[PDB]
Amino acid sequence: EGPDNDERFTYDYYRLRVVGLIVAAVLCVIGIIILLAGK
Amino acid sequence: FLGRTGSSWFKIFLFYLIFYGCLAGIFIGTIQVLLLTLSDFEPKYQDRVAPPGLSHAPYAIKTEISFSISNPKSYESFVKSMHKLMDLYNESSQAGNSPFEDCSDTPADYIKRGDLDDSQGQKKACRFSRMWLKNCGYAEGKPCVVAKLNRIIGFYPKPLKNTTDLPEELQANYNQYVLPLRCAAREKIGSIEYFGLGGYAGFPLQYYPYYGKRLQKKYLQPLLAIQFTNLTQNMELRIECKVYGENIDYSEKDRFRGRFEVKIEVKS
Amino acid sequence: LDELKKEVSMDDHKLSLDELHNKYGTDLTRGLTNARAKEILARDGPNSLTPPPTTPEWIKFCRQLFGGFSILLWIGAILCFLAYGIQAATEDEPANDNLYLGVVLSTVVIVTGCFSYYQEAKSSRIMDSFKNMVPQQALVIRDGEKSTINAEFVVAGDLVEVKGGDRIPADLRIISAHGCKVDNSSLTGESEPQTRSPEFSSENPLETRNIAFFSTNCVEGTARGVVVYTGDRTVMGRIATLASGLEVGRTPIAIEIEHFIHIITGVAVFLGVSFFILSLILGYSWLEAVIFLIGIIVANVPEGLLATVTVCLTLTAKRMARKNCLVKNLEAVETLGSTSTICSDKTGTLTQNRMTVAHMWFDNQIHEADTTENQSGAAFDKTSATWSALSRIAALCNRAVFQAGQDNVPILKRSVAGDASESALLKCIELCCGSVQGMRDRNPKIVEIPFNSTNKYQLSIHENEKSSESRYLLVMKGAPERILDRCSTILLNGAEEPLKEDMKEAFQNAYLELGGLGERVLGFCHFALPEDKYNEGYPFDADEPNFPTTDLCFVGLMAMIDPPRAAVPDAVGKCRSAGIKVIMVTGDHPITAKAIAKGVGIISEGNETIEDIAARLNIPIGQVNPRDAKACVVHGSDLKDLSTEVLDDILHYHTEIVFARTSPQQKLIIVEGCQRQGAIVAVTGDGVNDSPALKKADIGVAMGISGSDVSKQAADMILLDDNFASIVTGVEEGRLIFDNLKKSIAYTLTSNIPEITPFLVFIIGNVPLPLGTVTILCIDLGTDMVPAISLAYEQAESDIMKRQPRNPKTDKLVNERLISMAYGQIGMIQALGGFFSYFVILAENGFLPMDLIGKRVRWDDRWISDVEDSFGQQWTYEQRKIVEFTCHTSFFISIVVVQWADLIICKTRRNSIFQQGMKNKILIFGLFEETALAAFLSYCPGTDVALRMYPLKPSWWFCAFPYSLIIFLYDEMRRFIIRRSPGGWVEQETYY
Numbered sequence A: 001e002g003p004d005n006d007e008r009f010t011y012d013y014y015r016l017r018v019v020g021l022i023v024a025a026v027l028c029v030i031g032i033i034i035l036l037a038g039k
Numbered sequence B: 001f002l003g004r005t006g007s008s009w010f011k012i013f014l015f016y017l018i019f020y021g022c023l024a025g026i027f028i029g030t031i032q033v034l035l036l037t038l039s040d041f042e043p044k045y046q047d048r049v050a051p052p053g054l055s056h057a058p059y060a061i062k063t064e065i066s067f068s069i070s071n072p073k074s075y076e077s078f079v080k081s082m083h084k085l086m087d088l089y090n091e092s093s094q095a096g097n098s099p100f101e102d103c104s105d106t107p108a109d110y111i112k113r114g115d116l117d118d119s120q121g122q123k124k125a126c127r128f129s130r131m132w133l134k135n136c137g138y139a140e141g142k143p144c145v146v147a148k149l150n151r152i153i154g155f156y157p158k159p160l161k162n163t164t165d166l167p168e169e170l171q172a173n174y175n176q177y178v179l180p181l182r183c184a185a186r187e188k189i190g191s192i193e194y195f196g197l198g199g200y201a202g203f204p205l206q207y208y209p210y211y212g213k214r215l216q217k218k219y220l221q222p223l224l225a226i227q228f229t230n231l232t233q234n235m236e237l238r239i240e241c242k243v244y245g246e247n248i249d250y251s252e253k254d255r256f257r258g259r260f261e262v263k264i265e266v267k268s
Numbered sequence C: 001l002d003e004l005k006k007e008v009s010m011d012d013h014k015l016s017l018d019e020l021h022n023k024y025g026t027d028l029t030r031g032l033t034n035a036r037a038k039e040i041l042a043r044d045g046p047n048s049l050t051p052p053p054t055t056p057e058w059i060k061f062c063r064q065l066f067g068g069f070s071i072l073l074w075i076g077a078i079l080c081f082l083a084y085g086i087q088a089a090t091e092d093e094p095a096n097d098n099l100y101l102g103v104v105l106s107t108v109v110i111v112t113g114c115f116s117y118y119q120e121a122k123s124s125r126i127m128d129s130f131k132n133m134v135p136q137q138a139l140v141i142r143d144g145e146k147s148t149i150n151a152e153f154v155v156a157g158d159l160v161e162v163k164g165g166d167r168i169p170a171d172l173r174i175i176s177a178h179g180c181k182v183d184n185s186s187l188t189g190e191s192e193p194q195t196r197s198p199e200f201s202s203e204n205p206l207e208t209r210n211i212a213f214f215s216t217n218c219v220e221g222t223a224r225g226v227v228v229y230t231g232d233r234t235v236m237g238r239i240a241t242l243a244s245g246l247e248v249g250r251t252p253i254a255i256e257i258e259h260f261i262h263i264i265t266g267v268a269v270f271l272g273v274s275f276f277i278l279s280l281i282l283g284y285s286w287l288e289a290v291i292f293l294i295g296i297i298v299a300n301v302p303e304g305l306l307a308t309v310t311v312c313l314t315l316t317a318k319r320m321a322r323k324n325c326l327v328k329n330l331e332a333v334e335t336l337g338s339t340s341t342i343c344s345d346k347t348g349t350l351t352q353n354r355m356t357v358a359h360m361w362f363d364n365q366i367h368e369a370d371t372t373e374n375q376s377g378a379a380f381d382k383t384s385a386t387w388s389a390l391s392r393i394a395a396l397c398n399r400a401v402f403q404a405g406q407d408n409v410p411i412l413k414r415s416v417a418g419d420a421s422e423s424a425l426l427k428c429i430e431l432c433c434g435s436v437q438g439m440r441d442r443n444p445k446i447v448e449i450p451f452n453s454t455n456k457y458q459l460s461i462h463e464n465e466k467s468s469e470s471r472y473l474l475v476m477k478g479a480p481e482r483i484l485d486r487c488s489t490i491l492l493n494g495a496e497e498p499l500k501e502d503m504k505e506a507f508q509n510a511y512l513e514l515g516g517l518g519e520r521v522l523g524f525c526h527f528a529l530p531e532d533k534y535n536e537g538y539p540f541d542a543d544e545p546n547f548p549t550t551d552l553c554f555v556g557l558m559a560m561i562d563p564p565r566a567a568v569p570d571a572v573g574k575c576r577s578a579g580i581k582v583i584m585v586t587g588d589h590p591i592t593a594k595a596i597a598k599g600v601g602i603i604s605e606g607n608e609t610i611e612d613i614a615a616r617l618n619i620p621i622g623q624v625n626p627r628d629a630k631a632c633v634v635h636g637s638d639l640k641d642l643s644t645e646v647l648d649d650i651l652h653y654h655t656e657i658v659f660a661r662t663s664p665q666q667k668l669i670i671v672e673g674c675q676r677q678g679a680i681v682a683v684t685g686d687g688v689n690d691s692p693a694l695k696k697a698d699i700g701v702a703m704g705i706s707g708s709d710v711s712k713q714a715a716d717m718i719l720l721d722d723n724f725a726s727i728v729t730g731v732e733e734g735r736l737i738f739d740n741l742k743k744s745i746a747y748t749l750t751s752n753i754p755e756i757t758p759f760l761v762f763i764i765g766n767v768p769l770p771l772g773t774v775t776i777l778c779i780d781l782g783t784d785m786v787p788a789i790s791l792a793y794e795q796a797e798s799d800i801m802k803r804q805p806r807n808p809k810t811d812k813l814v815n816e817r818l819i820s821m822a823y824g825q826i827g828m829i830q831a832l833g834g835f836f837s838y839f840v841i842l843a844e845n846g847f848l849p850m851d852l853i854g855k856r857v858r859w860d861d862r863w864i865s866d867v868e869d870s871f872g873q874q875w876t877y878e879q880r881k882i883v884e885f886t887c888h889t890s891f892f893i894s895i896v897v898v899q900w901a902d903l904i905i906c907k908t909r910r911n912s913i914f915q916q917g918m919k920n921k922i923l924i925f926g927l928f929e930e931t932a933l934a935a936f937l938s939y940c941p942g943t944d945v946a947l948r949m950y951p952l953k954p955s956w957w958f959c960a961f962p963y964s965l966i967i968f969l970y971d972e973m974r975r976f977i978i979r980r981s982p983g984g985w986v987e988q989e990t991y992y
C-alpha cells in the first residue's frame, strides 16, 4: 500500500520455523523407516 | 620430477586450465541469472533492516565519548567525525531547483514522488540546512551530539498518537508530523537540549519515503542535534537516546535498534 | 633378545641315569635333601613363569593424543586461548568465542583419542595361559619320602613322580616308568599318546622317550624322573617367553592411516603458515593473524574422519561376529584382505583332528568312505555280504565305547573312551550299520586277546547271533601282513575261496596304495570254528593258544587318517584363486603332512618334489635339477641346519610348500621368512605350538572349538565354529572395507575445500566472512558423519576375489588420485556453490556482489552502526551480522546439498549409480538424517545463540542445487570415460 506498507518490512519467521521443524521431523521419521527395513 | 614426466605434467595443466575455466564461466553464469532476478531500485528483502537503527556522528570507541575539556587534542578525534557528517549538509551542495527542493520550514506530512520507477528523473529531495542545528569547532565542553535515523527505502516512519500516556507526556506533541527523540539516563545529573527542523526534537516527516540511492542521489536525511550541558563533571554517565513510533522497536541484542548508547565523561 | 629362543634346544638325555645325578647333585632313590632343595630354590629361583613388562593404559591413551590431527587441533585449541588471553587484557571482551571454541576443540581431541585408542587395542594374555599349564602342586621324593609340594618349589635335581591324569611339573629326565604314556600335543600339535621310558631312543631330545616336558600331561601309567629344567628354562617356558615377548608391530591398515595423516597434516601446515605470512604482508594485526590461523586449522583437519574409520571397522567386525568369526582387534578386520600368504597348521585347523576310516579293501576292490564331519559325501557299498562280515569284525573286535549321555550329539563328534583307531572303527560302523552296542549284545564276547606288542593282532571269540548256529565265531584285526600270514581263504562277495598268489598280490597293491595315501591300514579276518570240535560249553584259554589262529578267512582291509574339514579343500582353492600363497606348517610327520597337502590342494595334481622326480626317473636326488620341482617338503631336522638366506631361497623357488615336523620356533622362523620378502602373512592354528607364529603373523586366526587357550590368546581372530570357509569370507570382507574406506575418506575430505576457500577469500578479497569456525564443526562432526559411515555398507563393484592381493608398497589407502578428485575437482565445485548462496543472501538483502570487495573493515567495525548498502540504506552492527550469520547458515546448508551428490558419486569408484543402484539403506538414511539435522539446526529456536544458525527462507535451500547436479553429472561422465577405456588417462589420474 501507500503510507500503510508495513508488510514490506515484515517476515513470518515464526511460521517458517514451524514448517522447517515439521519437515526436519518428517525427514527424520522417513529415514528411520528406510533404515529399519531390516535393521 | 616429483610426480610425473613432463608430458604428464603438461596434460594435468591443460586439464585444470580448461576445467577451472569452465567452472569460473559457470559460476559467473549463475551470478548473471541471480542479478537478472533483482530490481535496480529496491532490494528483494527488507525485513533485516526493518526496525530503523539510530546512529550518531561522535565515533564511539565503545559506545563511549570520554575526553578532557582542559585539553585540545582530547576531543579533536570526535570533531573529525562530527565534521565529516555536517560537511555533507552544506548549502553549496544544495544548489538550484535540481535535484533539491525547498520544503516546509515546519514539520510536515509525507511526500510521494510516484513509484520506485525510472519513469521520472532523479526524485527531488527536501533541502536541509545545518543552520537548523542551533549551537552546533564543536562543543569543547559538554558535547553537542548529532542523531540520525537509518535510511530505508519506502519506509514511512509513523509517530505515536496521543491516545494514552507518553514518556514526555503531551509536551510539544506535534502528533501528526514529528518522530520524537528523548534522551535519558534516577541518575538525572544533566541538562538535555534538543535542536532540529522547526525547532522540534524529532524528524520532519516531509523527508519520507526514501526512494533509494539509484532513484535519489544527493538525498539528505533529517538530523537531530542534541546538547548535554550537564552541570556534572568527571564521571561516566550512561545516556540513552530513544526514538518513538508505530514502526519503531528495540532489541536487547541490537543496542542500536532505534536508540543510542552514549557514555559521556567530561573528565576535566 | 629373543634370537636365542628362536633356536633349537640342547639336552642331557644322552647321559646315563647315574651321570645325570652328578650333574644335579641328586639321589635316584632317596631324592634331594630338604636343605639342598631349599638351597637350590634360592640359587636358581622359583619354578614359575614371569609375565613380560607391559605398557600401562595411561601412556597408551595419551600416545594417540599427539598424532598429526590431534597436534594441529591442540595448536588450534591453545591458539584460541591465546587470542582469548590477549583480549581479556587489552579490550574487555564480554564474549565467549575463543574461550568456548578452545574448550570445544580440546574436547574433540580427547573424544577422538578414545576412538583411536579403541582401534589400537591389544588383548594379550599369552604368558597367563602358559602359567595355567603348571600344576598347583607336584609329587617329589625328598629324604626318601614322597610328599606333595607347591610346584613353584620344584628345583633342578629333585626326584619327581607323575601318573595318569597329572601335568608334567617341569622338564624331567625319565629314570623309571611303568606303562607311561604322555600327550605331547603342546610341542607337536598331535595328541596321540607317546610312551615314556628311561631308555634313550633318539638323538633329538624332542623325540626321545626318556624326556618328559613341562606344558604336557601324563595320560596313563606312572613314571619317575629327575628335574633338568625349571621355570623359564624349560623347553615350553622359553616358547612362552618367545611368544609373550615378541614385538606386536603396526598393522597394514594402521600404516595406511598414519600415511594420509602425514599428507593432510602437510597441506594443513603448508596453507596454515602460507596464509599466516600472506596476512601479515597485507598488514593484518597479530590479533587477527592468529584468528585466521585457527580457522585454517579447523578447515584443513577433517575432525570426524578418524572416528569414521573406527566406526566403519567396528560395523564390519559386527557382520563377521554374525558368521561365527570373532575379531579381538579391530584392525585385523582389514589385514585378512591384504594377506598374500597363509601359513597354516594342519591338525585341528585344516583337519578335523580325529582318526577317521577313509577306505576299505574287500571283494578285490577299493571302497572310499565319507570322511567329512556333516557327512556331505555318498555311500560306497551296502549290498555285498562281505561288507557285513567286515563290519561285524570292526564292531566285535573292538573295545571302544561312546561316553555316557552323547545320544544328543552327532556320531562323529561324540567323545569316545579308547585309542584313536578303535574309535574310528566304532564311529564307522555305528554310522552305516546303526547301534554297535546292539551288535555287541547279539554276539556275546566270551574270550579275547587284547592287542599285544608281540602278537601285533587282537582276537575275540563270540557267540554267533544266528539262532540256527548259536556257535562260536572268531574275529581278529592287526597289521595287514601279519593277518595275511594267518589266512587260507578269502570271503569274496559272500562265499569263501582259496588264497591264491593272484589275490595275494592284489592285497599288496591295495595295501601299498592306501599306505601311499598316508593312511594307517589294518587287516581284518574271521574264522567260524567247527561245531563238533567246540561244544556250547567249550572253554577257551586266552593265555595259552587253546584255539587255532591260522588258516583263517581274510575278510578285508580298512584304512584311516585324520581327515580334512569338509570346507577346507574348497577354501584353499579360493584363497589360491585370490592369488594368496598357501603354505603348510606342521609338527606332524612328513608322510601325513604331504598326503593332506594333496587332499586339501596345497600341492596341486602333477606337482613334484625333488624326491618324487628322483623316484619316478629312478635316479639320485643330486642328479635332479631342483628348479624342475615346484613343490617341496621340508623336515624340521633339515630346517634346523639351514640359514635364513637358504630358507628365503626355498620360499622364493617353490609355489607349493610343506614344512613338516617343525618346532614352535621353526613356525615363527617360516612366518618371519615370508614377511622378510615383503609379504603380508596370516597364520591359522589351534595348538600351543602355534602361539609364536600366531603372535608374529600380521594376523593370527585361531580355531574356536578345537583351539587351545594359548592359541586363542595369541590370535587376532577366532573362528568360533571352526568354519575354515570364514577365512575366505574374511579376506573378501577385508578387501571390501579397504575400498569403502577410500570412498568414505574422499567423501569426508571433499567438504574440506568449501571450508578452506571462504577463509582465503576473506583475506584476499576483504569481504564479510562467508563461513564460521563453529559452522565447520557442524559439518565434520554433525552432518557428514552418518553419510560417511554409510559408505561402509557398499557392495563390491566387481569380483574382488578375482584380483591379486594389494601391493602394500604401491597400493595406498589415500593417494594423489584421491586428493586430485576430492580437493581439486569436486571440492572446488562445492566451494563455488557455497559462495553463490553467500552472494545470493547478501544481494537480496541489499549488498550487491560488487560493493562487497574491501568492505570487511567497515563491516566488522562494531562502532559503525550505519553501513551503507548498494541501495543507500543504513545498517546497524547487529543487523548486518544477522545477515552475515544467515550467510554462514546457507553456506552450511549448501555444503549439505552438495554433499548429497558427493555421497552418491562416492558410492562407486568405477561403476555407474545406474549399475550399482541405490540398495544401501544406511546411505539413504544418512541423506534423510543429514537434511533433518541441518533443518533442525537452522529452524530450532535458540540455535541462533548457541551456534549462530539462522532460519533460512525456502528459496535459500535451492541455491546450491545446480552445483549439486553438476557434481553428479561430472562424476558420472568421468567414470563413463574410465569404463569406456581401461587405457589409463582418466583412470591413472582420478581412479581413487
Ligand SMILES: *[C@@H]1O[C@H](CO)[C@@H](O[C@@H]2O[C@H](CO)[C@@H](O)[C@H](O)[C@H]2NC(C)=O)[C@H](O)[C@H]1NC(C)=O
Binding pocket: B086, B087, B088, B090, B092
Ligand atoms: C562544508 O562546510 C564547512 C563549514 O565549516 C566548510 O569548512 C570551511 O573550510 C574552509 C577552508 O578549509 C574555511 O576557510 C572555512 O572557515 C570553513 N567554513 C565555511 C563556512 O566556509 C567546508 O569546506 C565545506 N565543504 C565543502 C565540500 O564544501
Ligand SMILES: CC(C)CCC[C@@H](C)[C@H]1CC[C@H]2[C@@H]3CC=C4C[C@@H](O)CC[C@]4(C)[C@H]3CC[C@]12C
Binding pocket: B003, B012, B016, C757, C760, C816, C817, C819, C820, C823, C824
Ligand atoms: C582457491 C584456489 C585459488 C586454490 C587452487 C588450488 C589448486 C591449484 C590445487 C588444488 C588441488 C591441487 C592438485 C591436487 C592433486 C594433484 C595430483 C598430484 O599428483 C600432483 C599435483 C596436483 C595436480 C595438485 C596441483 C594443484 C591443485 C590443482
Ligand SMILES: *[C@@H]1O[C@H](CO)[C@@H](O)[C@H](O)[C@H]1NC(C)=O
Binding pocket: B134, B135, B229
Ligand atoms: C548557543 O548559542 C547562542 C548564540 O547562537 C547563545 O545565545 C546561547 O547562550 C548558546 N546556548 C547555550 C545553552 O550555551
Ligand SMILES: [K+]
Binding pocket: C298, C299, C300, C301, C302, C303, C752, C755, C776, C780
Ligand atoms: K574440516
Ligand SMILES: [K+]
Binding pocket: C694, C695, C696, C697, C698, C699, C700, C714, C715, C716
Ligand atoms: K598377530
Ligand SMILES: [K+]
Binding pocket: C302, C748, C749, C750, C751, C752, C780, C784
Ligand atoms: K570435511
Ligand SMILES: [Mg+2]
Binding pocket: C189, C345, C346, C347, C348, C349, C685, C686, C687
Ligand atoms: Mg593343530
